[PDB]
Every structure is written in structure tokens, then in C-alpha cells.
Amino acid sequence: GGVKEYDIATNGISLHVTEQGAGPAVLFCHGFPDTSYTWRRQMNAIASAGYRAIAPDMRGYGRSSAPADASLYTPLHTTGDLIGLLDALKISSAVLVGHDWGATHAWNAALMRPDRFKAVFGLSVPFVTRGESSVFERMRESGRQDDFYMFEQIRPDADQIWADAAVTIPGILYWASGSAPEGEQWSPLDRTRSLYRAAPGPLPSWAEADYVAHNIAEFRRTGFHGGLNYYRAAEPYFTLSAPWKGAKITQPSFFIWGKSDGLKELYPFTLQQMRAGLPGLMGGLELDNVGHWVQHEASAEVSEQLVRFLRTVDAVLS
Amino acid sequence: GGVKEYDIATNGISLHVTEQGAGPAVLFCHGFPDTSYTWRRQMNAIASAGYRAIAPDMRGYGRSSAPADASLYTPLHTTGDLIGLLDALKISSAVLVGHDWGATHAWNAALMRPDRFKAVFGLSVPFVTRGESSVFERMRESGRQDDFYMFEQIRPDADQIWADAAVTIPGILYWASGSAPEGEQWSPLDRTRSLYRAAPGPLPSWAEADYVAHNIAEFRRTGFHGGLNYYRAAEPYFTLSAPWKGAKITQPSFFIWGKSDGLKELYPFTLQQMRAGLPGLMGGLELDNVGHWVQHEASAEVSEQLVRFLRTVDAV
């Protein structure tokens, strides 16, 4: 027990890594705008269940390299980071845990190297197989150029409108959570209920003060340019993702989101319909009154499902 | 038999497709500077054996689209072409056949989608696992910047060096084949023995005249910019290929190359040793007095090994 930190040189960048425990490897990948610290509770839970929790700051974030160039933030780059990390630690294989962009990048990693990534535990962002159409193209041809939030994030000025971390980190934690009043919650197609609105006072009890303070400090130092580069890379990445047009993830998986997550408006399918695409799905979970920040809003039941999942993966793997 | 031609909209481009036969799908991939016509003898041989031979012009060549941007010619772009081609033909899976750059990209495609590419028959270019360093930095670190031919093909002005297809296409068919006097055959590390030296008179009898005429005609109309973009893409693609750093190809695989191919110099491993990156390798054949153009210099041998390989892959 107890978290250790170090830095790894992998895939042409420097990767800041935190880890805890011993036993089979579990690689945690956070999204926007988060850090490795987002996983401390789950790391501690699975470490006491006999697993090695490994959680880097993803590239763009924290004490990891954050190259200016948005073309460097496709799933090909971060999967190369995760391979080079497993290589550098002499780990043969790991189970993947992802949230937000980490979930998207993790889904891709599992497609690319099932020999190394033996299972995927996805949070908030469901796996959708690659299509004929990128999301940016559909939003444009259906008129949502001024509505689909990702366009606002891709703009170079998004750096500036996020920069005030003391305000924007508590704000996004609040307005994308199940705590914001219904009808006020962030929605991806409404420019008036933005992600970065100031929070209206103290954060709900589920938001651990040590975590909120940690991430405010990280993002006051780093800024948001690298995190926002994940959005800027997604459309250029549609061209390079064509090899996986109909590709499915067959290793065991598991999926959890919150029913109050505004993201759900973009995935109007059931949990039964996620097996087309994820045939190894061992079970899903829709949490009532949880928003986007499931590993904080429902910390204990995320830890719990992850422990149960890992044991089931152990049984399958044996 | 009976060869037919058509175009397919796939992956945001046009792909010119030739095909022959019916049966399990075999997908041919040519390299530089070639066209789909390079496979006609193999296509005909496997059509007679019960297979559907499909041989597109790869992107950058022939009647396929040929965007100027070199960044559009990675294995990611050509695998997307092939997945989209199979989809458009509503074929579930296929065996890959690849030569030269077609082999390198076929290798990578086998890695990316084993669910759609069930076996790999490679010519001239062996699969080696992606490592710590690209061929480009190994050559820089070791002082070969003026020796390694790829640096010259990558130059923008390589478009003009190649352009006289009536000269350069017989040139490379001769100098990179087993018919050139040894010691004078093309070498990837010898400036003085380039690939585009003119031929000394007419081509050896093994170079089928309809094949030679087809390629000269296509490259007179297209130029060589698209093909050369395959070299211009390899180094940037090294950054994008870091997912596959240790990756092995597990599908059944076969490898053929010619003993007199200058490219041997770049792969000093034994074909026993190629099992490391290709654990499902079922055989490797090195051909005496054959150079780079194995499917032409040894057309009947390549054809008979591919029929046998396809029959072994089928029964498994």
C-alpha cells in the first residue's frame, strides 16, 4: 500500500507514472481535463485485492510531456505510449481502464494490441465501431457547427477560455455531474450549458477536496493546450483509423456510465446493443443520478465493479 | 479465367481493381514502380485452381487515385483501402499477396486486421518486427546518408529522375533482376549502382512483353510521384507505428525471395530466424539466379507455391 511516482521515457516523450500494489497489471487512462490523481481510490482498492495499479498522466497532462502539436494526440500515439510503458516495466500484459478520452483511446488500444491488452474496463464513453462517417462530418452536414461542443474545444482560443483552472475544474466537475439541477446539466449540443461554467458554490460531497485541489494545481501549471489537443486530433484521426472500419473488440470488457451524463444524448443505444462491437462484454452498468465523473460521483461502486471484473478476467485468462 | 476491370469508391479515393476467377479471395499488392498488371500470371494460375484473384492498382499508381501528399501513403492508408475494398465487394476475408512495398504494407495489414486477412504470402521483403529505431536513423547513425538509396528516392526531384518510363521501367526490370552481371546488380547501399540505370538493349526473355508495355504506358501517363511517396512516408509512419513495436504476425504465412536481390543486404537473417516475427510461417523459398522481380523472373515457381499455399491455408 502507498503510491509511488516516477518518470518514464517512452515513445519519444516523458511519461509521469503513479502506481500502487502488486500482482497482475491494470493500466488506468484518464481523459479531459483530468490527471492520474483521478484514480487514487480505485488504485488503492485494486492494490488491496492483489493487483498492480499503474496510472500515468496521459500525454498532454500533468508531469508528462505535452507537445504543442495536436497531430500527436491520436490513439496511435497514446497506444504507443502504453506499449512502451509496459515494455519499460517488463510487463507482458495489462487490463485497461479508461474514462473520457482515455476510454476512447483505450478502446482503440484494445483493438490494436489484444496480445498486450487483455481486457478493457470502459467508463462514460461507450465503444462505437468505426463507421463510414466521422462525428465531426455528421455534425456539420446536419447543421450543428455552432452547437456541437467539440468544435468550441478544437478552436485555439479554447486554451484561453479554460485557462483559469481554479474556476473551470470545479465548474466542469459540477456541471457535468449528477448534482447539477436537471435541465442545467452540460449538454454537448447546447452552447449555453457549457462545460466550463463557473460552479455556483461549494462542490458536492462526492468530490474529494484533495483531488480537486491537486488538479487545480496541475492545470494552473500546465494549462489546457495538450488536453484540448485530444479534440483537435480526433478528426485528422478519422483518416488514419480506416483500417478498423468494422473492427470489434473481442477480449473481455465492461462498461459503466451515469444516466445523468449529457454524453448519453450522443449514444442512444442500450447496453444490450453495445455487444455488437463489444462481443466480450461481461456486463454494463447505468448508475442513477450519476453524471460524467463516475469514478468520483460513484467512487465505491466503480472500485467494486472493477475488482469483480478483474477477478472474472483472471478466471477467463486461466 | 477472364480478367475484368472496374473502379471502387473506398476510403475517400478511387481504386482501380482487376480481378479474375471465383472462390476464396486472394488480394494482390504490388510495389514500386509497379501496377496491378504485375500479377496477371499468378491471377490466372489461381483462377484455374478455384480462387478469386483481386489485384488493384495501389493508391498512387495506374488508374487509382494519386494524391500529392506523401503523408497519405502509410500502411494505415493502404490497409484502409483494402478493408474498404473487401467491404465494397462484400467479401468477409482474404489471403494477402504482396511484393516490394506491397509486401511491407501487406505485412502491416495482416497485423492490424487478422479477422479480415487470414494469411500472408510475401515476396522479396521479409517481415521484421518494428523495433526501437527506423531504418532511417540506423543509416544516419552509421554514416550511410549518401549510400542508402531511399534517401535519394525521397527527394522531390526523384519524380524527374524516374519520369522517362520508357527508360526507367526496363532499367529497373534489368538491373534489379538475376540477369544483370553480378557485381553490377542494383545494391541499396551503392550510389554507383542505382535502380534507374538504363538497360543494355532489350529485356531478358523472362520479362513478358505485354507486362513491360502495360507498365511503360501507365507510368508515361501518371509519372512516379505517387509511388515515390511510399518512401517519403516510411519515416513519418515510424511515429505512427509505435503501437506495433513488438507485434508478431500469427496467421499462416509464406515468404519467397531471390538470391540475387540486392535487398538481401538489408535482411541478413536466415529464413529459420523469420519465424520469430512470423510464428505461423509455413515455408520460405530462396530462388537461385532470381532477383527482385520474382513473380516475373520465376513466374511459374511463384504461381505453383501460391496455389499450394492457398490449398494448405484452406484445409486448416
XYZ file of C-alpha atoms in Angstrom:
634
model
C 0.000 0.000 0.000
C 1.157 3.596 -0.650
C 1.534 5.337 -4.052
C 4.917 5.751 -5.791
C 5.754 8.224 -8.533
C 8.444 8.211 -11.224
C 9.044 9.287 -14.808
C 9.495 7.005 -17.807
C 10.987 7.888 -21.190
C 8.780 6.118 -23.725
C 7.792 6.577 -27.382
C 9.773 9.798 -27.754
C 8.123 11.506 -24.760
C 8.440 11.501 -20.989
C 5.596 9.845 -19.113
C 4.810 10.574 -15.460
C 3.646 7.363 -13.758
C 1.991 6.641 -10.418
C 1.488 3.107 -9.167
C 0.481 1.028 -6.144
C 0.217 -2.688 -5.409
C 1.498 -5.951 -6.856
C 0.040 -8.742 -8.943
C -1.489 -8.531 -12.435
C -1.157 -5.143 -14.138
C -4.048 -2.697 -14.564
C -3.373 0.392 -16.712
C -5.601 3.434 -15.925
C -6.103 6.132 -18.556
C -7.795 9.443 -17.675
C -9.434 11.972 -20.069
C -10.188 15.730 -20.240
C -9.441 17.612 -18.104
C -8.058 15.125 -15.554
C -4.792 13.604 -14.273
C -3.528 10.356 -12.798
C -4.819 11.531 -9.403
C -8.373 10.842 -10.627
C -7.789 7.097 -9.958
C -6.317 7.078 -6.408
C -9.395 5.447 -4.855
C -9.646 2.680 -7.490
C -5.860 2.197 -7.426
C -5.941 1.663 -3.652
C -8.962 -0.671 -3.895
C -7.445 -2.980 -6.515
C -3.990 -2.868 -4.890
C -5.539 -4.344 -1.743
C -7.202 -7.013 -3.920
C -3.823 -8.181 -5.239
C -3.312 -6.170 -8.439
C -0.694 -3.744 -9.700
C -2.409 -0.394 -10.378
C -0.499 1.759 -12.885
C -1.840 5.227 -13.689
C 0.158 7.730 -15.732
C -0.647 11.253 -16.576
C -1.561 10.812 -20.213
C 0.396 12.845 -22.739
C -0.778 16.446 -22.698
C -1.282 16.452 -18.939
C 0.330 16.711 -15.549
C 4.049 15.952 -15.326
C 4.020 14.153 -18.704
C 5.158 15.657 -21.987
C 2.603 17.938 -23.653
C 3.794 18.593 -27.230
C 2.284 21.689 -28.832
C 1.321 19.759 -31.982
C -2.262 18.446 -31.969
C -1.444 15.773 -34.582
C 0.444 13.891 -31.847
C -2.660 13.080 -29.768
C -4.319 10.315 -31.821
C -4.872 6.844 -30.314
C -1.842 5.701 -32.301
C 0.386 7.921 -30.179
C -1.105 7.073 -26.790
C -1.264 3.337 -27.553
C 2.413 3.617 -28.468
C 2.943 5.297 -25.104
C 1.135 2.459 -23.304
C 3.091 -0.207 -25.196
C 6.413 1.476 -24.493
C 5.420 1.817 -20.839
C 4.554 -1.882 -20.499
C 7.836 -2.595 -22.278
C 9.798 -0.342 -19.918
C 8.226 -2.007 -16.867
C 8.812 -5.515 -18.302
C 5.048 -6.217 -18.070
C 3.786 -8.728 -20.586
C 0.104 -7.751 -20.467
C -2.315 -5.441 -18.679
C -6.032 -4.829 -18.254
C -7.066 -1.353 -19.480
C -9.215 1.161 -17.512
C -10.277 4.352 -19.299
C -12.533 7.351 -18.726
C -13.470 10.175 -21.170
C -10.760 10.352 -23.959
C -8.917 7.613 -22.015
C -11.893 5.327 -22.693
C -11.827 6.148 -26.453
C -8.030 5.738 -26.647
C -8.307 2.546 -24.539
C -10.941 1.029 -26.838
C -8.507 1.666 -29.714
C -5.547 0.226 -27.805
C -7.520 -2.965 -27.185
C -8.252 -3.232 -30.926
C -4.629 -2.651 -31.890
C -2.817 -4.969 -29.436
C -5.050 -7.634 -27.851
C -1.852 -9.635 -27.333
C -0.828 -6.987 -24.742
C -4.140 -5.508 -23.539
C -6.148 -8.474 -22.342
C -9.318 -6.631 -21.182
C -10.906 -3.160 -21.193
C -12.945 -1.525 -18.426
C -14.651 1.484 -20.037
C -16.158 4.493 -18.228
C -18.621 7.073 -19.692
C -17.648 6.735 -23.397
C -19.038 3.584 -24.964
C -17.297 1.729 -27.762
C -18.846 2.503 -31.155
C -17.221 0.682 -34.044
C -15.618 2.931 -36.617
C -18.018 3.936 -39.366
C -18.226 5.430 -42.832
C -18.680 8.867 -41.172
C -16.714 10.882 -38.544
C -18.729 12.582 -35.803
C -17.476 15.965 -36.992
C -18.788 15.305 -40.503
C -22.283 14.319 -39.306
C -22.499 17.384 -37.040
C -21.531 19.654 -39.925
C -23.887 18.265 -42.502
C -26.795 18.328 -40.012
C -26.158 21.975 -39.075
C -24.552 21.710 -35.602
C -21.303 23.648 -36.315
C -22.189 26.174 -33.609
C -23.759 23.585 -31.243
C -21.533 20.506 -31.035
C -19.186 21.372 -28.169
C -16.123 19.682 -29.697
C -15.841 22.457 -32.290
C -15.573 25.001 -29.471
C -12.828 22.871 -27.792
C -10.837 22.494 -31.109
C -10.558 26.272 -31.519
C -7.087 27.617 -30.486
C -8.795 30.144 -28.079
C -10.183 27.180 -26.033
C -6.744 27.297 -24.403
C -7.656 30.703 -23.022
C -11.247 30.081 -22.101
C -10.192 27.073 -19.972
C -7.019 28.577 -18.522
C -8.467 29.722 -15.161
C -8.211 26.295 -13.519
C -9.423 27.446 -10.083
C -12.791 28.161 -11.765
C -13.012 25.720 -14.698
C -12.046 22.492 -12.920
C -14.699 22.862 -10.147
C -17.097 24.085 -12.835
C -16.766 21.099 -15.136
C -16.793 18.781 -12.109
C -20.110 20.315 -11.115
C -21.948 20.932 -14.403
C -21.224 17.502 -15.938
C -22.167 15.681 -12.714
C -25.441 14.267 -11.487
C -25.510 17.063 -8.900
C -26.318 19.956 -11.192
C -30.062 20.683 -11.382
C -31.828 18.710 -14.081
C -32.099 20.778 -17.212
C -28.975 22.786 -16.233
C -26.561 19.862 -16.758
C -23.959 20.176 -19.506
C -25.256 19.042 -22.877
C -22.923 18.544 -25.837
C -25.262 20.270 -28.317
C -26.136 23.363 -26.221
C -23.667 26.252 -26.334
C -25.423 27.849 -23.290
C -24.851 24.945 -20.877
C -21.102 24.831 -21.492
C -18.632 22.526 -19.727
C -16.555 25.365 -18.251
C -19.246 27.380 -16.450
C -18.226 28.582 -13.009
C -19.527 26.359 -10.255
C -22.208 28.024 -8.092
C -20.502 27.484 -4.753
C -19.085 24.523 -2.869
C -18.639 21.201 -4.616
C -20.824 18.218 -3.659
C -19.561 15.850 -1.008
C -18.562 13.204 -3.590
C -15.809 15.494 -4.925
C -12.755 14.777 -2.810
C -11.128 18.049 -1.767
C -7.629 16.599 -2.120
C -8.384 15.603 -5.712
C -9.959 18.921 -6.679
C -7.009 20.806 -5.162
C -4.484 18.524 -6.870
C -5.995 19.042 -10.332
C -6.368 22.811 -9.865
C -2.635 22.960 -9.108
C -1.697 20.722 -12.050
C -3.695 22.733 -14.561
C -2.563 26.117 -13.260
C 0.974 24.990 -14.134
C 0.302 23.094 -17.417
C -2.580 24.967 -18.926
C -5.028 23.092 -21.130
C -3.357 23.103 -24.571
C -2.392 19.421 -24.517
C -5.680 18.202 -23.085
C -7.649 20.175 -25.681
C -5.343 18.714 -28.368
C -7.201 15.415 -27.931
C -10.220 17.056 -29.598
C -8.122 18.700 -32.332
C -6.655 15.258 -33.222
C -9.941 13.303 -33.467
C -10.969 14.450 -36.985
C -7.488 14.115 -38.568
C -7.502 10.705 -36.907
C -10.622 9.600 -38.792
C -8.423 9.216 -41.888
C -5.859 7.007 -40.118
C -8.478 4.863 -38.346
C -9.893 3.431 -41.600
C -8.165 0.029 -41.017
C -10.601 -0.564 -38.120
C -13.744 0.281 -40.102
C -15.795 -2.623 -38.912
C -13.492 -3.779 -36.157
C -14.789 -5.312 -32.913
C -13.188 -5.740 -29.504
C -13.358 -9.427 -28.583
C -11.407 -9.505 -25.304
C -13.494 -9.271 -22.114
C -14.857 -5.782 -21.469
C -17.118 -3.938 -19.025
C -18.863 -0.580 -19.293
C -20.228 1.959 -16.767
C -21.723 5.414 -17.282
C -24.100 7.681 -15.382
C -27.671 8.128 -16.514
C -27.385 11.916 -15.950
C -24.313 12.147 -18.214
C -25.074 14.593 -21.014
C -22.885 12.339 -23.170
C -25.767 9.847 -23.373
C -27.514 12.147 -25.873
C -24.881 11.050 -28.443
C -25.213 7.309 -27.771
C -28.967 6.455 -27.872
C -28.372 2.667 -27.753
C -28.963 0.206 -24.917
C -26.333 -1.797 -23.014
C -27.603 -4.911 -24.858
C -26.780 -3.140 -28.185
C -23.182 -2.434 -27.080
C -22.279 -6.156 -27.531
C -22.434 -5.619 -31.259
C -18.977 -4.050 -31.253
C -18.093 -5.452 -27.829
C -18.921 -9.244 -28.054
C -16.767 -9.945 -24.957
C -18.781 -7.529 -22.815
C -19.263 -9.219 -19.423
C -21.824 -6.685 -18.189
C -22.704 -2.997 -18.093
C -23.961 -0.528 -15.529
C -26.155 2.576 -15.741
C -25.998 4.484 -12.441
C -28.988 6.626 -11.435
C -28.255 10.296 -10.662
C -24.602 9.998 -11.701
C -23.144 12.327 -14.311
C -19.835 12.247 -16.158
C -17.418 11.847 -13.226
C -18.386 8.273 -12.335
C -15.119 7.344 -10.575
C -15.737 10.219 -8.133
C -19.548 10.517 -8.080
C -19.799 6.721 -7.561
C -16.232 6.004 -6.410
C -17.028 2.925 -4.327
C -19.178 1.143 -6.856
C -16.635 1.812 -9.637
C -13.912 0.287 -7.410
C -16.251 -2.599 -6.658
C -17.192 -3.413 -10.264
C -13.517 -3.151 -11.250
C -12.488 -5.632 -8.548
C -15.267 -8.019 -9.603
C -14.377 -7.564 -13.292
C -10.656 -8.235 -12.751
C -11.456 -11.484 -10.920
C -13.698 -12.590 -13.791
C -10.918 -11.703 -16.276
C -8.499 -13.763 -14.105
C -10.817 -16.813 -14.389
C -11.194 -16.366 -18.185
C -7.410 -15.871 -18.638
C -6.780 -19.134 -16.763
C -10.454 -17.287 -66.166
C -11.342 -13.963 -67.841
C -9.940 -10.718 -66.355
C -12.244 -7.779 -65.668
C -11.586 -4.204 -64.550
C -13.585 -1.625 -62.621
C -13.238 1.217 -60.119
C -14.311 1.208 -56.465
C -15.049 4.170 -54.200
C -13.285 3.319 -50.940
C -11.501 5.170 -48.163
C -12.132 8.555 -49.772
C -10.355 7.704 -53.045
C -10.741 5.739 -56.273
C -9.210 2.252 -56.505
C -8.764 0.628 -59.901
C -9.437 -3.092 -59.499
C -8.668 -6.034 -61.758
C -9.957 -9.467 -60.881
C -10.329 -12.999 -62.197
C -11.908 -16.226 -61.003
C -14.321 -17.295 -58.295
C -13.750 -18.793 -54.874
C -11.895 -17.727 -51.732
C -10.465 -14.220 -52.127
C -6.765 -13.582 -52.750
C -5.758 -9.923 -52.662
C -2.597 -8.903 -54.552
C -0.493 -5.851 -53.622
C 2.256 -4.571 -55.989
C 5.094 -2.154 -55.015
C 7.395 0.362 -56.778
C 7.409 1.067 -59.594
C 4.653 -1.369 -60.485
C 0.950 -1.795 -61.266
C -1.695 -4.493 -60.770
C -0.647 -5.997 -64.122
C 2.395 -7.473 -62.387
C 0.158 -10.285 -61.049
C -1.538 -11.463 -64.271
C 0.271 -14.821 -64.456
C -0.416 -15.557 -60.764
C -4.010 -14.325 -61.059
C -4.605 -16.666 -63.999
C -2.966 -19.611 -62.205
C -5.097 -19.292 -59.064
C -8.263 -18.615 -61.069
C -7.786 -22.054 -62.623
C -7.340 -23.534 -59.128
C -10.640 -22.179 -57.773
C -9.743 -18.779 -56.281
C -10.974 -15.240 -56.861
C -7.880 -13.177 -57.696
C -8.257 -9.477 -56.891
C -5.409 -7.131 -57.885
C -5.965 -3.392 -57.545
C -3.662 -0.630 -58.642
C -2.398 0.547 -55.298
C -3.017 4.182 -54.412
C -0.557 6.417 -56.218
C -0.416 4.162 -59.298
C -2.219 3.353 -62.509
C -5.875 4.358 -62.614
C -6.075 4.635 -58.815
C -6.113 7.993 -57.142
C -2.710 9.516 -56.581
C -2.867 12.411 -54.103
C 0.279 14.547 -53.951
C 0.671 14.468 -50.159
C 3.221 11.879 -49.049
C 1.501 11.647 -45.647
C -1.360 9.769 -47.384
C 0.777 6.725 -48.257
C 1.336 4.918 -44.950
C 0.252 1.310 -44.288
C -2.684 2.883 -42.433
C -3.949 4.394 -45.692
C -3.419 1.284 -47.804
C -4.987 -1.043 -45.207
C -7.984 1.260 -45.126
C -8.101 0.910 -48.905
C -8.060 -2.875 -48.668
C -10.634 -3.143 -45.852
C -12.915 -0.791 -47.758
C -12.348 -2.714 -50.984
C -13.349 -6.040 -49.399
C -16.329 -4.292 -47.825
C -17.418 -2.860 -51.169
C -17.127 -6.347 -52.678
C -18.859 -7.825 -49.555
C -16.076 -10.300 -49.041
C -15.535 -11.409 -45.476
C -11.821 -12.304 -45.569
C -8.918 -12.813 -47.969
C -5.339 -14.029 -48.244
C -2.832 -11.242 -48.841
C -0.160 -11.410 -51.544
C 2.356 -8.603 -51.524
C 5.588 -7.675 -53.305
C 8.051 -4.845 -52.545
C 6.116 -2.022 -50.810
C 3.025 -4.142 -51.325
C 4.669 -6.778 -49.142
C 5.598 -4.327 -46.375
C 2.079 -2.919 -46.367
C 0.546 -6.419 -46.604
C 2.587 -7.432 -43.539
C 1.241 -4.403 -41.653
C -2.314 -5.111 -42.805
C -2.081 -8.691 -41.524
C -1.058 -7.254 -38.144
C -3.912 -4.757 -37.997
C -6.848 -6.941 -39.112
C -6.248 -10.696 -38.728
C -10.041 -11.043 -38.695
C -10.123 -9.977 -42.375
C -6.661 -11.022 -43.676
C -6.336 -14.722 -42.964
C -2.883 -15.425 -44.444
C 0.095 -13.543 -45.896
C 2.113 -14.632 -48.994
C 5.039 -12.178 -49.224
C 7.595 -11.602 -51.990
C 11.098 -10.011 -51.695
C 10.514 -8.017 -48.467
C 10.588 -10.046 -45.266
C 8.627 -9.073 -42.184
C 10.789 -7.813 -39.339
C 9.177 -6.640 -36.107
C 9.146 -2.862 -35.670
C 11.894 -2.037 -33.202
C 13.419 0.907 -31.347
C 14.720 2.618 -34.492
C 13.626 3.180 -38.074
C 15.868 2.108 -40.949
C 16.381 5.884 -41.461
C 18.148 6.602 -38.132
C 20.135 3.368 -38.306
C 21.520 4.583 -41.624
C 22.214 8.115 -40.289
C 23.869 6.900 -37.046
C 26.077 4.590 -39.097
C 27.088 7.106 -41.762
C 25.151 5.940 -44.841
C 23.318 9.181 -45.673
C 24.888 9.199 -49.181
C 24.686 5.427 -49.722
C 21.158 4.367 -48.763
C 19.036 4.624 -51.897
C 15.800 5.544 -50.076
C 17.255 8.980 -49.253
C 17.504 9.596 -52.990
C 14.018 8.300 -53.848
C 12.604 10.564 -51.077
C 13.986 13.687 -52.733
C 11.304 15.765 -54.534
C 13.469 15.664 -57.742
C 13.205 11.769 -57.864
C 9.935 12.440 -59.785
C 12.057 13.772 -62.669
C 14.807 11.094 -62.447
C 12.221 8.348 -62.993
C 9.859 10.140 -65.393
C 11.121 8.664 -68.692
C 9.273 5.404 -68.089
C 10.319 4.046 -71.489
C 13.844 4.102 -69.996
C 13.478 3.605 -66.256
C 10.958 0.748 -66.307
C 13.171 -1.558 -68.432
C 16.075 -0.115 -66.444
C 14.829 -1.392 -63.100
C 13.494 -4.677 -64.518
C 17.045 -5.431 -65.703
C 19.381 -4.095 -63.040
C 17.375 -5.438 -60.100
C 16.973 -8.899 -61.659
C 19.113 -12.035 -61.817
C 20.048 -11.377 -65.430
C 22.368 -8.450 -64.638
C 26.034 -9.481 -64.184
C 26.701 -9.974 -60.565
C 28.694 -7.246 -59.047
C 26.694 -4.899 -61.254
C 23.190 -5.699 -59.955
C 21.464 -2.951 -58.008
C 22.610 -2.546 -54.383
C 20.677 -0.444 -51.795
C 23.960 0.900 -50.384
C 25.902 1.627 -53.589
C 25.437 5.078 -55.145
C 27.211 3.911 -58.307
C 24.681 1.083 -58.919
C 21.289 2.854 -58.844
C 17.935 1.321 -59.802
C 17.300 3.613 -62.807
C 20.374 2.900 -64.932
C 19.217 2.331 -68.499
C 19.006 -1.264 -69.707
C 21.616 -2.642 -72.117
C 19.369 -3.430 -75.055
C 16.144 -5.426 -74.887
C 14.962 -7.069 -71.710
C 15.655 -10.717 -70.871
C 13.145 -13.146 -72.305
C 11.502 -13.657 -68.869
C 10.105 -10.090 -68.856
C 6.777 -10.652 -70.596
C 6.271 -8.056 -73.307
C 2.616 -7.351 -72.521
C 3.671 -6.700 -68.906
C 6.508 -4.334 -69.846
C 4.334 -2.439 -72.338
C 1.484 -2.072 -69.815
C 3.725 -0.530 -67.167
C 5.527 1.855 -69.525
C 2.141 3.045 -70.802
C 0.770 3.625 -67.290
C 3.834 5.428 -65.954
C 4.050 7.664 -69.073
C 0.515 8.851 -68.185
C 0.949 9.037 -64.422
C 4.596 9.721 -63.607
C 6.227 8.315 -60.475
C 5.245 10.892 -57.833
C 2.632 8.679 -56.161
C 4.867 5.632 -55.993
C 7.833 7.550 -54.589
C 5.506 8.860 -51.851
C 5.691 5.354 -50.354
C 9.324 6.056 -49.478
C 8.545 9.647 -48.431
C 6.026 8.210 -45.954
C 8.060 5.464 -44.275
C 9.931 7.694 -41.821
C 6.921 9.734 -40.585
C 4.988 6.476 -40.411
C 7.545 5.270 -37.859
C 6.000 7.591 -35.265
C 2.503 6.267 -36.068
C 3.559 2.603 -35.902
C 4.658 2.601 -32.261
C 1.547 0.539 -31.276
C 3.063 -2.475 -33.062
C 6.557 -2.332 -31.520
C 6.756 -5.955 -30.528
C 3.995 -7.259 -32.739
C 4.157 -10.673 -34.431
C 2.017 -11.909 -37.326
C 0.370 -15.162 -36.231
C -1.673 -16.051 -39.368
C -0.243 -18.692 -41.725
C 2.489 -17.046 -43.784
C 4.858 -17.852 -46.667
C 7.935 -15.996 -47.944
C 9.765 -16.118 -51.322
C 12.692 -14.027 -52.479
C 15.562 -14.173 -54.960
C 19.169 -14.889 -54.001
C 20.431 -12.172 -56.344
C 18.124 -9.456 -54.990
C 20.275 -6.608 -53.691
C 17.697 -6.223 -50.911
C 19.145 -9.343 -49.261
C 21.834 -6.986 -47.888
C 19.255 -5.310 -45.650
C 17.930 -8.524 -44.041
C 20.855 -10.769 -43.034
C 18.639 -13.159 -41.143
C 18.041 -16.718 -42.084
C 14.593 -17.798 -43.115
C 14.543 -20.042 -39.888
C 15.040 -16.744 -37.986
C 11.997 -15.113 -39.761
C 9.772 -17.490 -37.652
C 10.385 -15.074 -34.735
C 8.260 -12.309 -36.290
C 6.248 -14.797 -38.356
C 5.413 -17.729 -35.961
C 2.867 -19.141 -38.495
C 5.456 -19.209 -41.289
C 4.948 -22.457 -43.128
C 7.832 -22.123 -45.559
C 10.440 -19.910 -47.105
C 11.997 -20.289 -50.570
C 15.190 -18.575 -51.757
C 15.480 -18.739 -55.560
C 18.877 -19.049 -57.283
C 19.781 -16.550 -60.009
C 16.491 -14.704 -59.454
C 16.489 -11.056 -58.440
C 13.790 -8.689 -57.180
C 11.091 -9.407 -59.765
C 10.358 -12.969 -58.582
C 6.789 -13.012 -59.932
C 8.285 -12.418 -63.401
C 11.741 -13.983 -63.243
C 10.206 -17.135 -61.716
C 6.555 -16.746 -62.687
C 5.765 -20.494 -62.821
C 7.508 -21.155 -59.438
C 5.724 -18.240 -57.612
C 2.388 -19.360 -59.144
C 2.860 -23.020 -58.087
C 3.915 -22.065 -54.487
C 0.896 -19.706 -54.153
C -1.533 -22.412 -55.350
C -0.012 -24.868 -52.860
C -0.005 -22.281 -50.059
C -3.657 -21.354 -50.653
C -4.636 -25.042 -50.589
C -2.819 -25.562 -47.319
C -4.427 -22.417 -45.759
C -7.869 -23.618 -46.927
C -7.692 -27.153 -45.344
C -6.562 -25.740 -41.916
